[PDB]
A paper describes a structure:
The T=3 icosahedral calicivirus capsid is composed of 180 copies of VP1 with a molecular weight of ~58 kDa, which is divided into the N-terminus (N), the shell (S) and the C-terminal protruding (P) domain (1–5). The S domain forms a shell around the viral RNA genome, while the P domains form protrusions emanating from the shell comprising A/B and C/C dimers. The P domain is further subdivided into P1 and P2 subdomains, with the latter containing the binding sites for cellular receptors and neutralizing antibodies. At conditions found in the gut (i.e., low pH with high metal ion and bile salt concentrations), the P domain rotates and drops onto the shell with intra P domain changes that enhance receptor interactions while blocking antibody binding.
D348E is on the exposed end of the C’D’ loop, far removed from the antibody binding site. Since D348E can escape neutralization by all three monoclonal antibodies, it was expected that, like V339I, the apo structure would also be in the activated conformation in PBS. As with the V339I mutant, the sample used for structural studies was sequenced immediately prior to cryo-EM data collection and verified to contain the mutation. Fig. 8A and B show that, indeed, apo D348E is in the activated state where the P domain is resting on the shell. The loops in apo D348E are in the same conformation as the wt under activating conditions, but far more disordered. Therefore, the D348E allosteric escape mutation activates MNV in a similar manner as V339I. When the aspartate is replaced with a glutamate in the modeled structure, it is too large and collides with T343 and T344. However, in the activated conformation of apo D348E, the D348E side chain rotates up, and there is more than enough space to accommodate the larger side chain. In addition, this orientation places the acidic side chain in an electrostatically favorable location, adjacent to K351 and K345. Therefore, D348E could cause a push/pull structural change where the clashes caused by the mutation push the C’D’ loop out of the wt apo conformation, while simultaneously being pulled toward the activated state conformation because of favorable electrostatic interactions with adjacent lysine residues. Movement in the C’D’ loop is then anticipated to cause a domino effect in the P domain, leading to closed A’B’ and E’F’ loops at the tip of the P domain, a structural conformation which is resistant to neutralization by all three mAbs.
Numbering used by the authors:
A (entry chain C): 27 to 530
B (entry chain B): 15 to 530
C (entry chain A): 18 to 532
Write the structure that this text describes.
């Protein structure tokens, strides 16, 4: 290893008197250096000194084996050994610094002058053998608990002196670095407990379902194709189909796919001498519950597009025979005024152009889509003309990255053109249900995904699913490009925010 | 020593897989004083503050019989001493007594659960994955268990609760009896404890009476000298009656044991069935004298519709209520009088009331153009006609927040009622009108003023006569503020009113009572 | 008989020694020793000033302090290069009393994790303690031990430690005819005890906690008003003016969290930015509808603030100057004057909380203009009223609370400026007051000060002469108090500098100012 200005740290000798048990680990695990999650970097000649290359915390999460083992224990203590591997040759120059930051040091940005005031080592990019460091358990408690995250010693690596090299004309030269680790001889677990499947160290996974068998999250229809189209706007403001990976629902997106583009309301019918009868809807929750306006633009599932649509309602009439029917209505949602539509407050209006009297009763109805006229990809009007709390736009994307969109075709009544009508979404509803039910723990910023064919095995592309709930692709084309709908998405690993993808 | 040993005796099979744990030796260099406990306390096992339980043949495998957290609250001595310290540390010894009849059969499991294990979900699969002990219910000798202080700090704080080792007992195998005669026995289990050698407290602090351990006590008053919580009358009877509805929705007299006041119940017993309002009068050649009342709090503060169905102390039944109101008349010869008004609080009908904007009406039948002035007044009940034990409409067809109905009850369990009789007008019936409550106002004020800390789920009480010092029955008071007891008969049962209720211990819901 | 029991024994505190570095060394990375001469001198604590008055009642807490590096200026300065600390201290108390004064205080050692409610006078003597007369001429000293459950303490976390609490055991009374305004002064000093050190050597960082608050060296005459874009012209106190105003601008905590619609930049006050849409058909006039956004270009979202940052918080009619693009023959862009209404108005829809503003001009022609983004700045005020305007239709919007909760005899210091008013009758200037001027709103939220007490004692002193003009209390909520019992308004010269003395408790009694 190296001489670092620090004292030895006691592990199990400090924890043993108040531990019920001290548990030993498979001795073959002390003989292998394994790659750490989020432990890689690339240095380029364009990078400037002071960039953080990595920042890692001590704990069972650095080692996949120890992470799996910690599901059947109450606590852990002790230190680790770490290796940094750099890939340069003899014609490079530049320097890197790795320092040991103590558990309670404030979070923020460090300069090159401050990084040298920690216990640290400084390494040239021409180094041949791996650089060996200790990671010690500096703490104020006797042992750590496995199922919560505490403060611990950190390992921070920052570019110190810039890389100076030549390059060919075709590819820029980079210096790659990787960090590996293993437990030291003083490492232990504490108390054998019944294993738990839902652990903070649990990798995210996706349902094994091809997108052609999923459901669209904005319109009640099957997914008919996945694609990318740079010509269309890049940062929409869709209020349905938005979910965090940790399982937080954004906007008005519901859990179930039967709530999309629908609402439940108390309906009062009043015949008017002019156009005809008018039905007033007082909105409530779809499952049956009071609707109080708040942080949401509308009750969950409310349509989030602009246009004129028609709805079908279960209606009970009083005539000379015929208790109940199912009639249609007309509803306006666009920026045309003429109705005072305020879905945010919870009042809507509808009507039908009819003669004679059509008196009915108020009977706890539910409304469903029929068709759309003049549909446009723009936010509806949740107030009279006012503003509402709503979800942020989708993005931002790194330069050379573009959104991947799941597309379906909705019903049309326009007489102008007859080509198609396509509405897109960020994720199908099955992914929404999956993320909302599993409640994963997020590690850094984004997950490297992988689309491949079921039985042939051919890789199609690699993409990035951001924590916000949208998938980005590194594309540089100009015309729309579609993909086969018969593959399966698989999760590879967590990646940092600035991670360039392989192109199409 | 004893008669037939067709039983198990000693369950000396422990070999519990656990290392010894250090106690006060780790804490001494970080405490600023030298403290020690009276050595005689380390000498005998005493019953725990929540050390009674029961196993019945109706219990199913997986049911939790007890779970005790390590700390000063397992010992009455240590619980009383903990009021003068900030801090404890150390181990404990527990004795389990379950020595059931030779005709029974069954098994329990006792496990050592470490700190930070999630509470709630604990199944028959997971219990044996812990260091544990298997016990027969016939076992003659007391079973001895260690409770270790597994921790990652140096000592614990007496006030507030931290994570410590738990001792959990599951029913492993159902309890069944082999005897030919018509009945299955019940096993009555006891828990005793004492501190281990290196147990200690840390820093001497002023002894505060209101502390988390303490103990819930009740006032020493006979029920016949108490006041009713639903009608201003003395308590006249103690009754149980299975025929009456078992889950009523009374809004008065409802108090949580920890102290929280529920429903519309007041602290004082003079607010019950009374109300304060701003009165405005008018005269009509039809109905007569019509008074509109805008209700305000009976202490003179204004009333705002919030999380209560009505202002504090409002009547919570249906009927026609004759009330007396003080009125001032400008006509010569009289200045101040008391008048009787009629109040309609029954079912909704074709009536003219608008409580929505806070105007609630009363009527008086007369012909002469009575002259009266508006003001403020407090109205108290005088009589009831057509009484019905049912909640009145508060928002007139719109739901209002209400206290939950009283319940649930274990099978065979029935509510115990404090009964009083009210003045009423009857057209042709000579009987007295009876109204019941769950707890008299004295207990409501006691719990409101004392602010106790609950421990498990319920309290076991014993009712004892003062004339002979002889116990009448045992009952369960739930944390929700109602008392239940085990009765399987048909006709009503009445009890003497000159006894005293005494607190015995903390018990869980599934505790099986002896039948009365 | 046998023994003699003396009647007069000197006071002392019995202890059992508490281990410091011996407990912590095996799990600390380093154990770092401090300069040995720091162990030899008592030095005033940063929170080390308090007062006793005959208006205080027994059982009032005169002070309380937490063990840690923040009790000593040398230790507070050293703690910026370490991550932790362990060990014990000693504290010294000095009181400036008289032969007139009768009273007793008790100083007690309250352990960590004792419940924080309210101790009474009988319970305070059950802790280890010292009893002190207010007539004492010499200092009194006590030990502060590191009773704890952890191995060491993090420096940047306050955590829970041993406390030192002093309360009034017996009432303060003078034989004088009274009642007078005699105040007993008290000061606290400290030093580390033998077992004390730090834990892990880190880069020295100046923006840490235990960094004493300071103030910019700028005279008030060279500052900016925080509610109107004008230089500050007056410094005054007025008991006749209302005592608890509800200003939404100019509010900031000492820790730097902004309240209300306070902006960082000094060019944002009383201005707004919006997209404008202009309409006129035959006789309505050129009516402009503004959809507001944040002044930096960011979209406005209705949230925890009553309006976009920098919005006016005074009622009246505002006349503003706005750049507009015309398309008539000749001329492309000009600057026009517009009228708008801030306060309540029947039949009018003004909800800047929701982002909708309406303005009008009187036009003798069409003078049609294209739509786009504009920035509107104030130009004139008509009917200026100092009150909260109509933020919503009829609803309650999130607002900053009123100033409050001054002690008896305590009034609010005001920074005064003059606006550009258009009226027809009175030529008197109209004045607007602020609690803290700009350059004080900045210098907050750029420094993350940790307060460690309830009020700051300041000293106003001229630079040319050095004489003290007045002393005041700066509350954590971001306003200043003075002890002024007079009736008429009083003003002060505006060429002084505010100087930070120390941290004080809320009950601290200021010396009276003026007559």
């Amino acid at each position: 290893e190296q001489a670092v200005p620090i004292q030895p740290v006691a592990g199990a000798a400090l924890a043993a008197p108040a531990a019920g048990q001290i548990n030993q680990i498979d001795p073959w695990i002390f003989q292998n250096f394994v790659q750490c999650p989020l432990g890689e970097f690339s240095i380029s000649p364009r990078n400037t000194p002071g960039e953080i290359l990595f920042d890692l915390a001590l704990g069972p999460g650095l080692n996949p084996y120890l992470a799996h083992l910690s599901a059947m224990y109450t606590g852990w203590v002790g230190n680790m050994e770490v290796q940094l591997v750099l890939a340069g040759n003899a014609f490079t120059a530049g320097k890197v610094v790795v320092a040991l930051v103590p558990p309670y040091f404030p979070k923020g940005s460090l300069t090159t002058a401050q990084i040298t005031c920690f216990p640290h080592v400084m390494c040239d990019v021409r180094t041949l053998e791996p650089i060996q460091l200790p990671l010690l358990d500096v703490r104020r408690v006797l042992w750590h608990a496995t199922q919560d995250q505490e403060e611990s010693m950190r390992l921070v690596c920052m570019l110190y002196t810039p890389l100076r090299t030549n390059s060919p004309g075709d590819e820029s030269f980079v210096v790659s670095g990787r960090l590996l680790s293993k437990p030291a001889a003083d490492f232990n677990f504490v108390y054998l407990t019944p294993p738990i499947e839902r652990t903070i160290y649990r990798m995210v996974d996706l349902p094994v379902i091809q997108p052609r068998l999923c459901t669209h999250a904005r319109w009640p229809a099957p997914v008919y194709g996945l694609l990318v189209d740079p010509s269309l706007p890049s940062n929409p403001q869709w209020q349905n189909g938005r979910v965090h990976v940790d399982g937080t629902l954004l906007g008005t997106t519901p859990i179930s796919g039967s709530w999309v583009s629908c609402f439940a309301a108390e309906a009062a019918y009043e015949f008017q001498s002019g156009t005809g009868e008018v039905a007033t809807f007082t909105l409530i929750e779809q499952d049956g519950s009071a609707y109080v306006p708040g942080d949401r633009a509308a009750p969950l599932g409310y349509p989030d597009f602009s246009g004129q649509l028609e709805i079908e309602v279960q209606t009970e009439t009083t005539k000379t025979g015929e208790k109940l029917k199912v009639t249609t209505f007309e509803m306006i949602l666009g920026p045309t005024t003429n109705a005072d539509q305020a879905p945010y407050q919870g009042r809507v209006f509808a009507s039908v152009t009819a003669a004679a009297s059509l008196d009915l009763v108020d009977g706890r109805v539910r409304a469903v889509p029929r068709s759309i006229y003049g549909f446009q990809d723009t936010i509806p009007e949740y107030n009279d003309g006012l503003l509402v709390p709503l979800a942020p736009p989708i993005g931002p994307f790194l330069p050379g990255e573009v959104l991947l969109r799941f597309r379906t075709y909705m019903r049309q009544i326009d007489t102008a053109d007859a080509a198609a009508e396509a509405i897109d979404c960020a994720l199908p509803q099955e992914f929404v249900s999956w993320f909302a039910s599993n409640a994963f723990t997020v590690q850094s910023e984004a997950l490297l995904l992988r689309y491949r064919n079921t039985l042939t095995g051919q890789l199609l592309f690699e993409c990035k699913l951001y924590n916000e709930g949208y998938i980005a692709l590194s594309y540089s084309g100009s015309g729309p490009l579609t993909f086969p709908t018969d593959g399966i998405f698989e999760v590879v690993s967590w990646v940092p925010r600035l991670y360039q993808l392989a192109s199409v």
